Design an enzyme around this catalytic site. Sequence first.
Site, PDB file in Angstrom:
ATOM      1  CG  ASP A 132      24.977  32.894  -8.580  1.00 34.44           C
ATOM      2  OD1 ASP A 132      25.042  33.971  -9.222  1.00 34.44           O
ATOM      3  OD2 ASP A 132      24.028  32.615  -7.825  1.00 34.44           O
ATOM      4  NE  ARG A 136      23.183  38.304  -7.439  1.00 36.27           N
ATOM      5  CZ  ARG A 136      23.416  37.096  -7.940  1.00 36.27           C
ATOM      6  NH1 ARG A 136      23.125  36.007  -7.235  1.00 36.27           N
ATOM      7  NH2 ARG A 136      23.932  36.964  -9.152  1.00 36.27           N
ATOM      8  CG  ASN A 137      25.289  34.662  -4.319  1.00 38.04           C
ATOM      9  OD1 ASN A 137      24.219  34.602  -3.706  1.00 38.04           O
ATOM     10  ND2 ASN A 137      25.351  34.509  -5.633  1.00 38.04           N
ATOM     11  CG  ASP A 150      24.593  31.017  -4.352  1.00 33.92           C
ATOM     12  OD1 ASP A 150      23.693  30.173  -4.318  1.00 33.92           O
ATOM     13  OD2 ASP A 150      24.917  31.623  -5.382  1.00 33.92           O
TER      14      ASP A 150
HETATM   15  C1  LIG Z   1      14.677  41.069  10.669  1.00 33.76           C
HETATM   16  O1  LIG Z   1      15.356  41.022   9.425  1.00 33.76           O
HETATM   17  C2  LIG Z   1      15.952  42.260   9.091  1.00 33.76           C
HETATM   18  C3  LIG Z   1      16.658  42.094   7.775  1.00 33.76           C
HETATM   19  N1  LIG Z   1      17.734  41.108   7.823  1.00 33.76           N
HETATM   20  C4  LIG Z   1      19.003  41.417   8.117  1.00 33.76           C
HETATM   21  O2  LIG Z   1      19.355  42.564   8.386  1.00 33.76           O
HETATM   22  C5  LIG Z   1      19.990  40.288   8.127  1.00 33.76           C
HETATM   23  C6  LIG Z   1      21.138  40.376   8.913  1.00 33.76           C
HETATM   24  C7  LIG Z   1      22.065  39.347   8.925  1.00 33.76           C
HETATM   25  C8  LIG Z   1      21.930  38.277   8.049  1.00 33.76           C
HETATM   26  N2  LIG Z   1      22.815  37.191   8.196  1.00 33.76           N
HETATM   27  C9  LIG Z   1      22.912  35.965   7.625  1.00 33.76           C
HETATM   28  N3  LIG Z   1      23.829  35.154   8.182  1.00 33.76           N
HETATM   29  C10 LIG Z   1      24.027  33.999   7.587  1.00 33.76           C
HETATM   30  C11 LIG Z   1      23.280  33.519   6.479  1.00 33.76           C
HETATM   31  C12 LIG Z   1      23.425  32.257   5.848  1.00 33.76           C
HETATM   32  C13 LIG Z   1      22.677  31.899   4.735  1.00 33.76           C
HETATM   33  C14 LIG Z   1      22.736  30.515   4.215  1.00 33.76           C
HETATM   34  C15 LIG Z   1      23.447  30.196   3.064  1.00 33.76           C
HETATM   35  C16 LIG Z   1      23.473  28.885   2.628  1.00 33.76           C
HETATM   36  N4  LIG Z   1      22.868  27.876   3.264  1.00 33.76           N
HETATM   37  C17 LIG Z   1      22.205  28.181   4.383  1.00 33.76           C
HETATM   38  C18 LIG Z   1      22.124  29.463   4.898  1.00 33.76           C
HETATM   39  C19 LIG Z   1      21.769  32.830   4.219  1.00 33.76           C
HETATM   40  C20 LIG Z   1      21.621  34.069   4.773  1.00 33.76           C
HETATM   41  C21 LIG Z   1      22.347  34.436   5.933  1.00 33.76           C
HETATM   42  N5  LIG Z   1      22.153  35.683   6.469  1.00 33.76           N
HETATM   43  C22 LIG Z   1      20.740  38.133   7.342  1.00 33.76           C
HETATM   44  C23 LIG Z   1      19.810  39.158   7.333  1.00 33.76           C
HETATM   45 MG   LIG Z   2      22.851  31.219  -6.841  1.00 32.99          MG
END
Ligand SMILES: COCCNC(=O)c1ccc(Nc2ncc3cc(-c4ccncc4)ccc3n2)cc1
Ligand SMILES: [Mg+2]
Length: 265
Positions: A132, A136-137, A150
């Site tokens: 995948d 986006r991942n 992911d």
């Molecule tokens: C108040 O919200 C405003 C919108 N969000 C962001 O701008 C935003 C900024 C940084 C990230 N960062 C981030 N950092 C690490 C992550 C890690 C995972 C993850 C993947 C797999 N297993 C667990 C967690 C998923 C998303 C993750 N996202 C996410 C959203």
């Molecule tokens: Mg996936």
Amino acid sequence: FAKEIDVSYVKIEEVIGAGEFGEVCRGRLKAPGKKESCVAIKTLYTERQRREFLSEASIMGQFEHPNIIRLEGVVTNSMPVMILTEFMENGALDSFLRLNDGQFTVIQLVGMLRGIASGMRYLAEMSYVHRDLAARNILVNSNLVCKVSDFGLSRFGKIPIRWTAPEAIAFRKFTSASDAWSYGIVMWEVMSFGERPYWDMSNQDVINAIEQDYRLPPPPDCPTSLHQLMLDCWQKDRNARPRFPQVVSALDKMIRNPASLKIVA
Ligand SMILES: COCCNC(=O)c1ccc(Nc2ncc3cc(-c4ccncc4)ccc3n2)cc1
Ligand SMILES: [Mg+2]
Ligand SMILES: [Mg+2]
């Protein structure tokens, strides 16, 4: 599990996104004898669903690479079930690039692709097939370091048609060579600052187009050498595609010779 953590060491700060099985939060992890760190938290159903959600944590915990998202821990003994990873300030690469459309140089974009390719080189060396791989991942930190995310030991949600190699769609044969096709799509997403692959086509149109020799055109201002690397990743014969060490080597050569990147069709 490797990295089981006491729930009292976790403080949930705010909801930062929406994941497949629930919310994505930003939090703070403070364990005895360790410095406080910023974390991203995925919170979680049937027993098979719980084992599938946690399978992400199982494999992530066995990887250690600067371009692979770091597992900080899991909460399984207590409820709700959580997966804690390093926090990535800039979030998902596709949305990050759309927000910063045309604002990063070709050299910066190549550095991002090199980082993704190093992460994929590590996964292919570990005999781990992503299946995948898409912008986006990919997660981006404050220093623009791109990390593959992911992970899972589950079998195909639905096959992500736009990112999947033709032999993987047709015969469900997923290999590091079908990931090389996906990587070519990620290169196109990056050079297009997060445009949707084949934006003007449906999933069935994409399957038909690829089988009929269509390949995504070079994004505006894309260096020819980068589009050629995309075409190499998109060879119909999986054995003809560059392997990840070759992809990293080609990108390092570009970084070392930036004049080559000036040639645009
Ligand atoms: C108040 O919200 C405003 C919108 N969000 C962001 O701008 C935003 C900024 C940084 C990230 N960062 C981030 N950092 C690490 C992550 C890690 C995972 C993850 C993947 C797999 N297993 C667990 C967690 C998923 C998303 C993750 N996202 C996410 C959203
Ligand atoms: Mg996936
Ligand atoms: Mg190592």
